[PDB]
Design a protein around this nucleic acid. Structure first.
Lengths: 53, 122, 120, 56
RNA sequence: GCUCAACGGAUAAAAGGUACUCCGGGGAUAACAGGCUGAUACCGCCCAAGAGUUCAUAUCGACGGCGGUGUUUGGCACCUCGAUGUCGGCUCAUCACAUCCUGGGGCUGAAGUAGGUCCCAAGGGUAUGGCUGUUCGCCAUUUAAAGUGGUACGCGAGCUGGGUUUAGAACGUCGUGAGACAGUUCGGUCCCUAUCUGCCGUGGGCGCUGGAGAACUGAGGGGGGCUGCUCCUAGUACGAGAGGACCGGAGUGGACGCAUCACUGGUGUUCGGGUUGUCAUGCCAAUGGCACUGCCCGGUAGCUAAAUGCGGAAGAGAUAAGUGCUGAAAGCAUCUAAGCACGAAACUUGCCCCGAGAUGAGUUCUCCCUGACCCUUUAAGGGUCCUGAAGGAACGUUGAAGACGACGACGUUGAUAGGCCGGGUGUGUAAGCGCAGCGAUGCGUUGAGCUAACCGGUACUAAUGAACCGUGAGGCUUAACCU
RNA sequence: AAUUCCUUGUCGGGUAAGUUCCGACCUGCACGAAUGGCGUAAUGAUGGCCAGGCUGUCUCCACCCGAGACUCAGUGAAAU
RNA sequence: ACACAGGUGGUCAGGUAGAGAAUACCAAGGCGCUUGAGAGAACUCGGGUGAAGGAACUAGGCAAAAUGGUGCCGUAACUUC
RNA sequence: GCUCGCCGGAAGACCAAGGGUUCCUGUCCAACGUUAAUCGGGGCAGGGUGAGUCGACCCCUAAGGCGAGGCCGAAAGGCG
RNA sequence: AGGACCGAACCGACUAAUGUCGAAAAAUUAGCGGAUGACUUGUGGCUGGGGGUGAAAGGCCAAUCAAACCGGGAGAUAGCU
């Protein structure tokens, strides 16, 4: 199994979703980017929260 | 003959009495803490208004072992307790002002000159 | 290691060992001579000799001790009354080992052990 | 655990080479009875170094 | 003409589960491992804007390209399905170098100091725990450093079975149901006496061209090779302040390895004492047996560590990266092709151990042996008798020597072993008697009594003279030396 | 959760450090009411987890007592 | 299958200590287990003791160690009392 | 024969079951006994078990079996 | 009084070691659970193979269990070895 981490953001993913190595790796790449995608929205929520404030 | 996972009595007015060693300093893979060495310890039991608290890590020097110490004449000085004195882990100086019980001559080094001056005997 | 270690085990636990030589000791003084294995006789010499030495002198204290060891009244009669006096001059070395032929059953080296007086 | 091939009879002949028992040739003689007793061992009739020590 | 789901149509009437499974076969066909390959992974180079204050050759480096290693995942089924029978941990390792440290150097935007990057180098060292079934990984505390990999993802005819993949049971989801599962959750037999190769030790035979007893040279081989801290040189050099040296010297620790018990201790069922229950000596007493040594308290010699000493070299020669002289090619310059000098824990030695089976069988010193008739390939010969030495072996008493052998001391011309005498050491005021007390018991005699392996003496006992083995002057050829 | 894949979920307690454990939130991949739900003193050769005590499990093994192992005499196998 | 450390119903069952048919030592009575003698290595099995620390080993306190008896005092949360 | 050690609510002393001369005596040692054997539950010959009161047999029955006729069933047979 | 408590005999068989061509074709040692009950045991009967019995495992039915043993179909069949 693969375990990619994102040290600048510390987030880690253990893609055991598929069977073959590279399949899990790019899906892990898919998972990690998916994490950064969402986490960027929460800071954007931190952005949108103050505007209402 | 002191090592990690060893319970010691503290011979000072620091505010702790039940301590537990976790690591012996000095070289690498060392196993024993002789009567005149430095060891990293934690705190298991402390008095209420103390200078320290439960579960607090800082360096400490031992002064009494049940194992004792052989002197250059072949004579040993065994005790009936494992007493240590706490030190401020960063400055290595004692955090207590009152030392209890007899100590040995083996603390004759600059890092413990203040310690020996407060002990009641030897 | 056995370095400088004396005394033999003789395939027996101590409790059995001391009791074994005790019965052997009395049997010796009763017949003046007996036939046994070499190793046992070679270690029997460290048992009866102190008794004979304790027999050279006669005291109420010793006769009790001579009974403390060997646990026998008839045997102590043989001592202090026959051996003690007849071995007054002899100073140490009261036994004699004669290596006889092997035991027919297990080819064990048998040896004869006697008392050096045995006038007959 | 166990053998793999059958060692020949020739191999066995070398294994028992050192298994040869030895003779003694230490036959001493008695002085009186002149009997053939071993060295340091008493004779059959109980003579040793010219003395009837067995008393039998 | 209903009529052949698969359309040369098993009769135009037909679905699943099985991990107790069972039988017959296959490495013709999968999973682990090995193999070829090297897409992928990993590592190393080329072109080269840009980023970086200015400048891409301090570093990183897009755009693309060129190769290598065989450690990731895969590709193909070559080997094994009349078995290659397991992931991790424990123990034990061993090799590579693309180096985690320590060493030697180049460059800097390297002031000082501390770092970054690259080249040489395998010598030696390269943590303890919490959590998980764990490798990995996260955290805690260090450390000089807590290296990256190979070695059936090292190691199970060495250990464990936690995981997982046999049989029981439960939960959730799916399925009409059996049951299944990108799943999880309690519990679940690890067999083998070693023939051979190999390795760690130890012997016998024979050889060494005469035999025997000792001491060595020494080819070759092995072990060993780590390093921190403080201080001095000097709070100098350097530095605006702050901080803070290379080189050299001395002392002291950590880890590891070797040796040894004088010290600190452990053990010490062969030494002494106390004591519960019980049996026996007629009885009391005094002792002994048994109950894990009955349970415990101490303790000699040994053995041993946590105890005590000691080691790692320094140095020399030839080198790596690297540093220079002179000087070419090429009138200049140039560490270079001639030639010369430095230059690492690396190479060879230096230190310690084995070591002449080194068949190349060596060197040195000492000791011992110079009888007869025949056979007859007239042969380095054999038969028999007279002699069998130096020495060894056997037997015996035994060792801080030892599985058995072997090795060492001794065999009366004697201290080898046991015993005996004395001392030492250990244990704690014996037994008996007298006195005081209602009694347990106390006190004097008495630090006595008893004392395993230690030390010094004594032949009291046992190690008996010889028998047995082993020989009787050691071939040929040539050179140089003696008549 | 004996039920939660992503996930060792996110917060407090416990430890120097806690993928397990004890409380709490709710986004219930895929809880739920006799396919019984939620609590429950006591009981249990039951699952998981801390503390005291105690010790050779361990750091690190050391010595000693017995039965084998080894040697000698006797009888004398097996898998392969 | 054996001269096999296993299994086999019912009766009687003493002395001292002891609650006891537990256990310990003995009685009556029956036996020393049918291969032995030496050595006292590594290692294996059954055990004793162990300085300092006391789970730091480990899947896990598995195994061991320890607690243990009689009388008196005293004894929480919780509870179906 | 003289000491020693072990079990002793058993490793002791008697019956039932079940075996079948293993019991006693003399004699023999090839085979059997995991060794030797002058020993033996081993070979060979002889001897030994005595009952109105002990037990079985016998009288009476339990569970249950068999079962005159009878009932049922291809037959065998089954129930009673 | 108690499907009560502690605990021998008896029954049972949780943990570890030993053993694995063993002493034994599941036992030995040291600790364990129950031990007035749904307890245990001696003797003699009844139930039978796709049936018996089952506090239910798919366990047991003469060391043999998702199908006992014996004999006969039967020299079953075998695109496989």
């Amino acid at each position: 199994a693969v375990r990619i981490t994102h040290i600048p953001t510390g987030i880690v993913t253990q893609c055991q979703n598929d069977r073959s190595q590279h399949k899990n790796k790019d899906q892990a790449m898919k998972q990690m980017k998916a994490k950064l995608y969402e986490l960027e929205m929460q800071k954007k929520n931190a952005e949108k929260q103050a505007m209402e404030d | 003959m002191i090592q990690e996972q060893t319970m010691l009595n503290v011979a000072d007015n620091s505010g702790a009495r039940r301590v537990m060693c976790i690591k012996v300093l000095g070289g690498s893979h060392r196993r024993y803490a002789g009567v005149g060495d430095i060891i990293k310890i934690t705190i298991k039991e402390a008095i209420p208004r103390g200078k320290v608290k439960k579960g607090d890590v800082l360096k400490a020097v031992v002064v009494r072992t049940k194992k004792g110490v052989r002197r250059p004449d072949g004579s040993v000085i065994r005790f009936d307790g494992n007493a240590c004195v706490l030190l401020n882990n960063n400055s290595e100086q004692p955090i207590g002002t009152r030392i209890f019980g007899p100590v040995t001559r083996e603390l004759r080094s600059e890092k413990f000159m203040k310690i020996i001056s407060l002990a009641p005997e030897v | 290691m056995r370095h400088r270690k004396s005394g033999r085990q003789l395939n027996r636990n101590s409790s059995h060992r001391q009791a074994m030589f005790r019965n052997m000791a009395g049997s010796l003084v009763r017949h003046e001579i007996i036939k046994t294995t070499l190793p046992k006789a070679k270690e029997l010499r460290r048992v009866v000799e102190p008794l004979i030495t304790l027999a050279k002198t006669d005291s109420v204290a010793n006769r009790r001790l001579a009974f403390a060891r060997t646990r026998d009244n008839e045997i102590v009669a043989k001592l202090f009354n026959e051996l003690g006096p007849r071995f007054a001059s002899r100073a140490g070395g009261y036994t004699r080992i004669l290596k006889c032929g092997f035991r027919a059953g297990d080819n064990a080296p048998m040896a004869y052990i006697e008392l050096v007086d045995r006038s007959e | 655990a166990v053998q793999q091939n059958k060692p020949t009879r020739s191999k066995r002949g070398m294994r028992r080479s050192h298994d040869a028992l030895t003779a003694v040739t230490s036959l001493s003689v008695d002085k009186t009875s002149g009997e053939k007793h071993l060295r340091h061992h008493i004779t059959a009739d109980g003579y040793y170094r010219g003395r009837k020590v067995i008393a039998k």
